[PDB]
Design a protein around this ligand. Sequence first.
Ligand SMILES: [Mg+2]
Ligand SMILES: [Zn+2]
Ligand SMILES: [Zn+2]
Ligand SMILES: [Zn+2]
Lengths: 57, 67, 56, 48, 263, 147, 45, 61, 49, 113
Amino acid sequence: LHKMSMMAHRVKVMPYSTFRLNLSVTSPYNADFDGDEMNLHVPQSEETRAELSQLCA
Amino acid sequence: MIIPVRCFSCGKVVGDKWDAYLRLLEEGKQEGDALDELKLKRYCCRRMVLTHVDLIEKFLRYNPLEK
Amino acid sequence: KYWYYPEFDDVVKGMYLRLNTGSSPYKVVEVLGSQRIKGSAYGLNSKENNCDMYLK
Amino acid sequence: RDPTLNKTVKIRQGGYKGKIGIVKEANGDRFRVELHNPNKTIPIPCSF
Amino acid sequence: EPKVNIINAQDDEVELMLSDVNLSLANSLRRTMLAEVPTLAIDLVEIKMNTSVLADEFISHRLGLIPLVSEDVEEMKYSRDCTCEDYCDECSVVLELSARHEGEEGTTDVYSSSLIKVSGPGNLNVGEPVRRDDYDQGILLCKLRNHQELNIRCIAKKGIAKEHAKWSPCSAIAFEYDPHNKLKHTDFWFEVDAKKEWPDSKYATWEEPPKPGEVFDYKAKPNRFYMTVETTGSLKANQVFSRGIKTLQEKLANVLFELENSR
Amino acid sequence: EDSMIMNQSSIDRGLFRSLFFRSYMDQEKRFGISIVEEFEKPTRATTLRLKHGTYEKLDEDGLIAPGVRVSGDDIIIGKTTPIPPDTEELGQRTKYHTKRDASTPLRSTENGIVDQVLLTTNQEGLKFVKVRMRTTKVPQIGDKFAS
Amino acid sequence: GVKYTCGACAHNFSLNKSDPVRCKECGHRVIYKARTKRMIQFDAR
Amino acid sequence: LSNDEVNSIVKMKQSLSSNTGFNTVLKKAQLQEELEEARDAHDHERVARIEAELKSIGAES
Amino acid sequence: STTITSGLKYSLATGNWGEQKKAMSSRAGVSQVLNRYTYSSTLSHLRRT
Amino acid sequence: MNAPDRFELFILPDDVPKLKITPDSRVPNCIIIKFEREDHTLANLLREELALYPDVTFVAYKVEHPLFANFVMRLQTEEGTRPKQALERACASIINKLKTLDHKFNEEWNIKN
RNA sequence: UGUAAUCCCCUUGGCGGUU
Ligand SMILES: [Mg+2]
Ligand SMILES: [Zn+2]
Ligand SMILES: [Zn+2]
Ligand SMILES: [Zn+2]
């Protein structure tokens, strides 16, 4: 709905099969943990990585 | 399907008390008294025997697939 | 285990076996032959053991 | 041509002693064996 | 300085009171008894034939949960620490089960008494499934009708309840201290009066209730702990308590050795 | 936020554990007077464009047997369709591709034990098989529960 | 070469990839394969 | 034993036995269908025989 | 005999309540696959409007 | 699928040390101890034992994440005492307490047997 | 020295899940 629905996080590799979020960011995403799913997109370049870390963080 | 070996919550072995429980209920004892006579104090254990549904008696009625 | 064999008829011929007289003192009888009897199916060992071979 | 590929194998050492599996990958000195007991595939040295 | 006082004693449960110990020590002892005392349990099932209505892994899960006598499990070695190829008699116990129904009518029950110990460590009292009495049939494993057969070979290994709950010797450890709430460690929810709305603790008679004019004592600490240890029959209650203490001692000694060897 | 904490020891003792079955179907199609599909274990020599999975779990009749553990992309049904031969009969010692693979692989994300294999004939008189796979699903982080 | 079991009478037999799919005694049209001879092992967990 | 001998022993057992469990269900179902056909034709004579046969065959446990 | 047989079988199999060549403009979804996830779901599906 | 092996809770890899000690230079005479394959059972015992020593001025521990079996402990003693000696004294004292507890329980059990 | 394999519809329809 708004531009806070896409934000760039830092990866931390963990066991088990679910994405894990700090609960403070569940408000901008309008998400809760009753079955919601979220999408992850990986940048493929140095320029794109810099854009993500400097603009959408 | 068949009486669980261990109570889910604590881990007491309740799998050896199904036949005794049925025998006690046969003699007219109430369910609470039957569970008390088997020394099931915690209600976590009591729900295991009280709410078990025995479905294997229905699966066994089908003719075996081999002989 | 072996009554239904085609050769069992000659195999059982002349054999000596313990027999229940019924009328029980067990005794020995000599097999003069065998004769299949239709409609005389009988339990041999269990309920499913339906046999129609007969021993004379 | 990796004669032990697609052959039943048993593990004799490590944390999976005595588990039956089937060899899937045989690059070298590190064999990928799927386990019959859980639904997973693990690497394992040839000596094991 | 520490003291132990036993209230009730049985083969399967002991009710005792600890005193002059810290709350942390009692809780660590409870945790160790719950999840760090080694026992013996079935860990591999080789199913040679299973024509029963239950799934193979259903029966395997049921078998793993059957308690086995683990009295001499200290002499036994861990499977991963045994240099023997495959499994030897010093790191595994082999049990075998064979059940069959004869006749074309009726239903046969498969009990844990049918588990027969085939091989194991020499002269060690381990591996036999636990039986309440000599005439106790045991845990119901399966049911069979005509022409259904179950033929399996099970291998029992040594482990702890951290890895899987089937190796836990205890069922439930009741733990309790300060029945009269003199330390004010809990605040009692109420509607009208908190004193008459809350049931008395089962050990309330073991401690003197606070006097009406008594002031709060800020210098007091929990000092007496009441705990009941129930076992599944694989280990006796005294054995569970003593082996929990020994396991805690071994853990602390390992830490001490690591510290001393670090320099 | 609607999550919940579950007891691991209760899960170990069988709480909310369940059983999962999936069935696969396949049948021999008839394309003409003598163009039929065949259930068989295809060979790397006589067939072309084989699946990247493994065919070593198939029996002589091209069907897996119950009790065999299977993984993703494994071949549980072996089927081939005839293809008009090429000019490879020039100098190939019978090792020329006459059939094309139409095998059924197990789903990539699934694995389990082959539970029961059914073989019969369809309405048209051709062969017709059904393979049922069984696995156990234990509760874990992310599974959905409800009162 | 490979065993089979009838779906009604549970009679074991075998087929040679050319016989009609049928039970040889009772004529049932549905047959099942027999269990594999390999070793089956489970982790009991 | 040979294959032919096995087939003969099968034919011996099948011609000996009056019964096979699954097939008794099929005969009773066929008899019920024939009985309803006779009922729809208002044949009061055939239906009595079919009822007697069904009574004789039935009474399971 | 193929006319009625194929028409009934097609309409019950696909759910389009009409002739096969008039699939458009026909009422769809009349016939559905029975839900067998659990007993209550089947009972609910059999009493749906 | 992604579930780790259960034995990783207590089985120590060869390359991972059981006990890593690093000084904390922000305050004098302080060390940070990282225990591997341990949990609240050992940590709480050690912490509450050390909290009673007059020469230990700060002791604490935390488990960073429940899905990883390790904990980190912060210890900080007086000027005279090296912290590692205090840790060793705590371990030995708890061992003696457990030993006398076992002896007394055995005596009581034999009496009431 | 006998040397191992790389590929997948489409259109409709229904039923669901997260808002
Ligand atoms: Mg939601
Ligand atoms: Zn319980
Ligand atoms: Zn060994
Ligand atoms: Zn048959």
